[PDB]
Subunit: 304 residues, 6 copies
C-alpha cells in the first residue's frame, strides 16, 4: 500500500498548541476559577467533575483570547506580546479554534448528554456576540446601550454561563443560577471596558486605551458618542484606529467631558445592587450564605 | 424591573452573522462531496431523513472551511469570484466560518445518534491538525517529506470526506468499514487539486495562476521539485517570496517541469487510483453490489491527470 | 537700504503655480459647459465681451475643481490620462486648483457688476457644501437617501451650472429666471455621469472600470441598490473596501443589475428630462424664442440612458 | 416636481465646520489679534468694522492651518492631534477651503469695494507663497535666502498685510502702514523657523524639529545647506522626511556646526532695528507714540 | 585539541554563494561583449589561453554587475525573466555579485601579468564612479548636462568595454592603443540602450515598458527632453514619481516625442558612429588589417537607430 | 570630436565618498588599530609600510560597516543614524563597494606581490562569511555552533587575518601568527554577539537587542534555539524581525531561561585560555613578552 497512516505524535501536538501554551504560560487573574469556586458552595459538584469543568473553561478562555487578539489586532496581552506577534496570525488562529474542539472532547468526559448541548449553545452564543461586535465596528455604526448589553450577554456572558450551566448539569438542586451569573458577566465586561480606558495596570497589560486603537464601541464610548451626536470627533477617532497616544489622550479627555465614566460607574452600581439582591433572594429560599460570591462581586468592581 | 432584559436572537442578526457564508453559498461550485455521499449511499442506504441531515452538515462545514482557508492562505479568488473576506473583511468572514462549525454540530444532534458527536469532534480535530501542520511548514520554510505531506492531507482534506462516510456508517444497518477507501479518495482528490492549481486553465480562472505559489504552500508537486535537486534553491525561495507576479510563477512552473514533477505526480495518482479500484473490487467481491457511481467519481476527480 | 526688497511676481513663477492646471487644460475634454452657456445665450444675449469673461471664469473653475476632486477621490485617470497629482503630487495640484479659484474671482471683477461677487461667493459656498456632505457620507459609511443625495448634487454639480447662468443673467437686460431649469439640468448631468461611470466603455477608458466603487462613493444607482435590500450588505461593504481590483467591481456591477438599479436610474432620468422639456416649453410659450440648442444639450447629456 | 430643493441646515453646517471648529477649540497665542489692536492705536477703526476684520483674519488663519497641516503632513498642532488625523484629509481640506469663502462673505459685510479687491489679492499671494514653498520642497532645490523671503512675504506676510490693509480701507488716514506690517510678518516667520528647531514649547506643540520631518527649506536650514555645498547630509536628511528623533538631533547638531542659529539671530536683530526705525519714522510724521506695537515686536522675537 | 577547527570551503557552500549568479547565467543573453572581444582579437591576436581567461573574467564581471544594477535600480525583469533578487532577496543577490568581483580578480591573476591587477582595479574604480554619479543625480532630482552624462557613461558602461580590451592589449605583442575607440563604442552602446529602453518592443518584453522612467533615471533622451523646455516640469516630476503604471509612462513617452528627443538621439548616435568608422579606418590605414567583424558589431548595436 | 573625456574631480570624489566620510566622522573604538600595534611588537613593520596597512584596514572596516548596516537593515551605528538612512541604500552601498577597490589600490603601494593575493583571498573570505550568514537568516535554518564559527572565521576573522597577514608579508620573521589572530577574531565576534544583547552601551549604540530585529542566528541565539527544539518561540521571533522592545525583552528573558549567556561566557573563557596559551607558546620560542596583546585580549572580553 502506497500510503500508510501515521499516529498523531506528541511533537505535532506541541506544534499545534504552540500559541495556546505560550498564552497559558502568562499569569492571569483567574477570575473564572474563583467564580466557579464561589458557585460550588451552593452546587457542591464533586472534584472529579469540577476539575473537568475548570479545565474546559480555562481552555476555552485562553483560546478565545488568542482569537480575540487577532480579530482586534491587539499588541499586548497580560503585559507580554500577543501570541500571534510571535507565531503569526494563521497558526495562532488555528491553535485557538483547535482548542475549541479539544475542549468539547474534554466535556464528553462527563458522559452527560445535557452538557454537550450546553457547550454547543454557548459556543453558538459566543460567536453571535463576536459577530455583532465586529459588525458594528466595521460598519462604523454605534449600537445603542441595549444592543451592546445583548452582545455582551452572548459573548463575555456566554463563558460565565457555560461554566455554571455545566455545574448545574452535574448537580441535582433545582435552582436556576444562570440569571445571576449572566448579570455578573455583564458587570465584569462593563468594568473591563472602563478599566481599559482608566486603569494604569490595564495600560501596562494591553497599552493605553487599546479599545480606541481597536475601534471598539465599548460601554463608555457608546455613551460618549451618543451624548452629543452633533460632535463626531470620538466616532471618527474610532474609525482611525489610532496607535498614537496623543489621539487616545484627546479621546479620553473628550469622554470625561461627556461624563461617560461617572455614567459607567453609576450603571455598575445599579447592577451590583441587583446582583446582591439576587444573591439574597437565592439564600432566603434555602441556600447557605455565600461569602465568596460577594467577594467576587466586590473584586470585579473593585475599581469603579 | 431589571436594568437589563435579554433579547431573543433575531433573523436579521442571523443574516448578519451568515453574510460571508451566504455569499459563498451563492457561488456555484462543483458539489462533488454530494456525489461522493450519493455514491457511497448505493452501499450504505442511509434513510432519506438522516441522509439529508448529513448532506446539510457536510455542505455547511465545507463552505465554512473555505471561508477560513481563503483567509489563512490570503487567497484572492474563490470559484472565479472575490473571496468572501475581500468583501466582508477577514474578521467577520473568519467568525462566520467558525460560527457555522457550531451550527453544523447543532444539526448533527438531529440524528439522535449517541456516536455522532464523537465522530464530528474527531473529524474537526483532524481538520485542525492538518491545517496546523501545513501552516507550520509554510511559516518555517521547511519542506516536508512526501510522507509527512500525505499524513497532513489525510487529516485535512480526508477529515471531511471521512466525516461524511463515518456519519453514514453510524446511521446505516451494515457494518462494512469504508473509511480506508474514502481516506484514499480524499488523498487522491487533494493531489489532483495540487496538480490542477498549477496546470489547469479552469483553475487559473477560478483561483488565479498558480496560486499555491503565491500562498507559499508546500504542495505535492512542489515538494517533489524542491527535493529532487536540493542544491538548487530557486523554487523554495520563490515560495518564501509569496509572489503575486505572473512572471515569477511562470518561471517556477517551468522549473517544476524541468524536474519532471508533473509526470511524477500523475504517476503517483495512477498508483493510488489502482489501489482505490482494487479496494472497491474487494468490497464488491465480498457481497456489495457493483458501484458504477463511485467509479465515475474516481474517474472525474482524476480526469485531467 | 532695506535688508529685504520685495520682488515682483514673474511669469516663470506663475508657470510653476499653474503647472498642474495647465497640464489638465492640455487634455481634450467635451467642453459641455461651453455648449450650455451658448444654448442659454440664445435667450440671454449677453454681449460678447462679458460672455467671454464668463466663459473663461467657468472654464477656469471647472478645471480647478477637477484637480481637487481627483485628489479628494484618489482617482487615477482623468480624460484617459494620468490625474495631475500623479505627476505633480497632491500638494502642488491641490494648491494650484485653489489658487485658480481666486484667479477666477479676479477675472469675475472685470464684469464691473456690483452683484457678480456675491453670485460667485454663493456658488463657491454651495460647491464646498456639496463636496463636504459627499465626503461626510463616504467617510462615515452611511448611505444617504436619494433625496439627500440630490440636494448634495444640487449644491455640487449644480453650483457651477448655476454660476454660469447666474452671471449671464446678471449681465443681460432681461429678468427671466433660468436657474431652476439649469439646476435641473445639472442634476440630470450628474445622474447620467453616475450611470455612465459604471455602464459605459468610454468612461472605463477615461477613468477606469467603475471607478466610483474604488472611490467608495454613494452615487445615484449605488444608493438605490444598497437601499433596495438592506439585509444584503455586500455592496456597501465593497464600497468600504475601495477596491482597485476589477473582479470585485464586476461582481458589484452584477449585483447592481440584480437589484434593477440601472433601470431605476434610467426611469428617473426620463422623468427629469420630461420636467426639463416642460420647463423649456413653458419659457418659450411665455415669450422666449424656440431653443433648439438647449434641446440638443439635454439629448446629448442623456444620450446613453 | 420630482426634486424639491432643501434649505441648508445648522446640522449640515456643523458637519462642514467639524474640522474648523475642532481647531478653534484649541488655544492659540492670538498674535494677529494683538497686531490688529496695536495698529488700531493709529488707525482707530470703529469696533463694528474692527470686529468684522478680526473675525475674517481668525477664520482665514485657522483655515490656513488646517490646510498647511495636510500639505505638510504634520502630526501635532497646538500640542493636540492635527484635525485631519481625526476627520481625514479630505474633509479637513474641504472645511478649510470652505471657510476661505465664508470669510469672503464676511468681508462683504463691510460694504467696501476696495476690501473685496484686497481680500482677493491676499488670497492670491497666500497661494503664490505656498506654491513656491511646495515647488522647492518637492524638487529638492534649495532656494536662496532672497527667494525664501519673497515667498514668506507672500505667505505669512499675506495675512498680516490683509489685516492692516482692511483696516486702512476703513480709515481715512493717508499713511502707508503695509511696509512695516510686511516686515513684521517676515520677522515672525523667521522666528517661527528658528523656534521650530530650538524651542521646547514648540517641541511640545508640533514635535521635535518638525520642519525636518516636513522637508522644508526654512530660513536656518537654507543657511546651513548653502554654507557648505560639498557636504550634502542636511539636504539629504530633508529628502528623507525623517520621523526619527535620532536623525533630527543629528541634523540639529549639524546646523549648529554651521552657525546657522547665530546667523538667524543676527538677521532678526537687523530686521527688528529696521522695524523700530520704521515705527519711529511714522511717529515723527504725526502719529502718537505706539507702545503696543513695540511690545508685539519684542514678543515675537522674545526668544532669539 | 583546539575548541575551534577551521573547515575547508565546500562545493555546496560555493553553490549557495553563487545561487543568484548561476541563476542569471542560466538566462540566455546576447553575448555582445564576446563578439566585441573577438572583433578586437582580429587585430590583437591574444593567445587562446590568455584570451579564454579574459573572456571568462569579462563574463563574470558583466553578470555580477547586472545582479547589482538590478537591485540598485529596483528593476523587475531581466532578460524577460524575474530579476535575481526577486527570487533570492536583495541581500544575497548583492553579496553574490560583489563576491564574483573578487573571484574574477583571482581569475585575472592567472594571466601572470604584472600590469593586469592595476588595469582591473582602475576599471572597477571607474565602474563605481559612474554608478555613483548616476545615483547621485537620480536621488537629488538634478538633471545632468549631456556632457556630464557622457562622462558618467564613459566610466560606467565604458569601464568594462575598456577592461576587456586593456587586458587584451596587455597580453598582446603589439602596442596600438585601441582604448579611445572602445570607449566610444561603449558610449554608443549605452545611448542605443537608453533609446531602446523607451522605443523597442523587444526591450519592453525583456525589461518592461519604459523601465528607465520607473527607475527615475536621467538617460540620454530623457535629459534632452527635460532640458529642451525647462519651463515644463512634467517629465522630471514623472521621474520623481518612479511610476510603475503604464499610463504615466505612455504619457511621458508621448511628451518625449513632442520634444523631438528620439530624433535628437538618433542624430547623435549617427555622428558618433561616423567618428567610430573614421577611427577604425585610421587604424587600418596605418597597418592593421581590414576588420569586418568590428563594423558588424557597430552596425548591430545601432541597428534600430 | 563630439565627446571629450573629463578628469575625475575632487568634488565628484567627495560625492562618491559621502556615506563613507559620514561614517568615518563618527568615533569608533579602534580595536583593529590596537591589534595591529600589539602584533607589531613582534613583527616590527616600519611605519611607512605600517601606515599603509592601517589605512587599508580602516578603509575596509568602515566600508564593511556601510554594507552590513544595509544588508542587516540596521537603524543606528555608533549611536548615530546609519549612513543609508541619510544617503539612501544605493549610494551607501556603492560607496562601500567603491572603497573596497580604493583599498586595493592602496595595498598596491606596498609593491608586494604576495600582499595582492592576501587581499583577494581575504575579500573572498569576507563575502563567503556574509553569504552563509544571509543564507541561514533568509532560510530560517538555525546553523550549528560549528557552522557559525566557520562563518565567523571567514567574516569577522577575515579582516583580523588580513591585517596581520599583510604585516607578515612585510616582515622576514618566519613565525605563523594567523592561528592566533583568527582565534582573537572569533573571540571578538562572540563577545560582540553577547554585548549586542546584554550591554547598555551597545543598546545606546545600535538599539536594544538589534540582532533580534535583524533576524540573526548569533552565538547565544543559536544555543538558546537548539537547547529546546520543541519550543519554537525564539526562532519565530527571529522570523518576525521585531522592532518592538516588548518582543525583544521577552526574547532576552527566554534566552536567560536557557542559560545561553552563561554558556557564552564559558566558551569565551575557554577560547581566551587557548589564546593565552598560544601567546605563551610563541614567546617560549623566541619572541619578547607582549604585554599589549594581553591587554587587547582582556579588553575585548572585558565584559563577560
Ligand atoms: C481571569 C481569568 C479567568 C484568567 C486570566 O485571564 P485574564 O485575567 O488575563 O483575562 P480577563 O478575565 O480579564 O478577560
Ligand atoms: C466540490 C464540492 C464539494 C462543492 C463545491 O466546492 P468547490 O468545488 O469549489 O471546492 P473543492 O471541492 O474543489 O474543494
Ligand atoms: C465637459 C466640459 C464642461 C469640459 C470637459 O470636462 P470633462 O468633460 O472632462 O468633465 P465633465 O463635464 O464630464 O464633468
Ligand atoms: C497666533 C495667532 C494669530 C492665533 C493662534 O495661532 P497659533 O499661535 O497657534 O499659530 P502661529 O501664530 O504661531 O502661526
Ligand atoms: C550582451 C552581453 C555582453 C551578454 C548578455 O547580456 P545582456 O545582453 O542581457 O546585457 P547588455 O549587454 O545589453 O548590457
Ligand atoms: C573597532 C574599530 C576597529 C574601529 C571602530 O569600529 P567600531 O568599534 O565602531 O566597530 P566594531 O569593532 O565593534 O566592529
Amino acid at each position: 500500500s502506497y500510503y500508510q497512516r501515521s499516529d498523531w505524535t506528541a511533537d505535532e501536538e506541541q506544534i499545534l498548541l504552540g500559541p495556546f501554551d505560550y498564552l497559558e504560560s502568562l499569569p492571569g487573574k483567574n477570575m473564572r476559577s474563583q467564580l466557579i469556586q464561589s458557585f460550588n458552595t451552593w452546587l457542591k459538584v464533586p472534584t472529579e467533575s469540577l476539575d473537568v469543568i475548570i479545565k474546559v473553561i480555562s481552555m476555552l478562555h485562553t483560546a478565545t483570547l488568542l482569537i480575540d487578539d487577532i480579530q482586534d489586532q491587539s499588541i499586548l496581552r497580560r503585559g507580554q506580546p500577543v501570541a500571534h506577534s510571535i507565531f503569526g496570525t494563521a497558526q495562532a488562529m488555528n491553535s485557538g479554534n483547535y482548542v475549541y474542539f479539544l475542549a468539547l472532547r474534554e466535556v464528553q468526559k462527563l458522559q452527560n448528554p445535557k452538557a454537550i448541548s450546553i457547550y454547543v449553545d454557548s459556543l453558538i452564543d459566543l460567536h453571535r456576540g463576536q459577530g455583532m461586535e465586529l459588525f458594528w465596528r466595521d460598519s462604523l455604526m454605534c449600537p445603542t446601550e441595549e444592543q451592546y448589553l445583548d452582545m455582551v450577554a452572548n459573548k463575555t456572558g456566554g463563558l460565565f454561563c457555560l461554566a455554571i450551566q455545566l455545574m448545574q448539569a452535574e448537580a441535582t438542586i433545582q435552582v436556576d443560577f444562570i440569571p445571576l451569573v449572566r448579570l455578573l458577566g455583564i458587570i465584569f465586561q462593563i468594568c473591563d471596558d472602563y478599566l481599559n480606558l482608566k486603569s494604569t495596570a490595564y495600560t501596562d497589560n494591553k497599552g493605553l486605551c487599546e479599545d480606541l486603537t481597536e475601534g471598539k464601541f465599548s460601554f463608555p464610548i457608546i455613551h460618549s458618542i451618543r451624548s452629543n451626536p452633533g460632535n463626531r470627533q470620538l466616532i471618527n477617532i474610532l474609525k482611525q484606529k489610532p496607535r498614537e497616544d496623543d489621539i487616545k489622550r484627546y479621546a479620553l479627555s473628550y469622554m470625561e467631558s461627556t461624563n461617560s465614566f461617572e455614567y459607567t460607574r453609576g450603571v455598575v452600581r445599579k447592577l451590583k445592587t441587583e446582583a446582591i439582591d439576587t444573591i439574597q433572594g437565592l439564600e432566603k429560599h434555602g441556600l447557605e450564605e455565600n461569602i465568596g460570591i460577594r467577594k467576587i462581586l466586590a473584586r470585579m468592581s473593585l475599581e469603579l
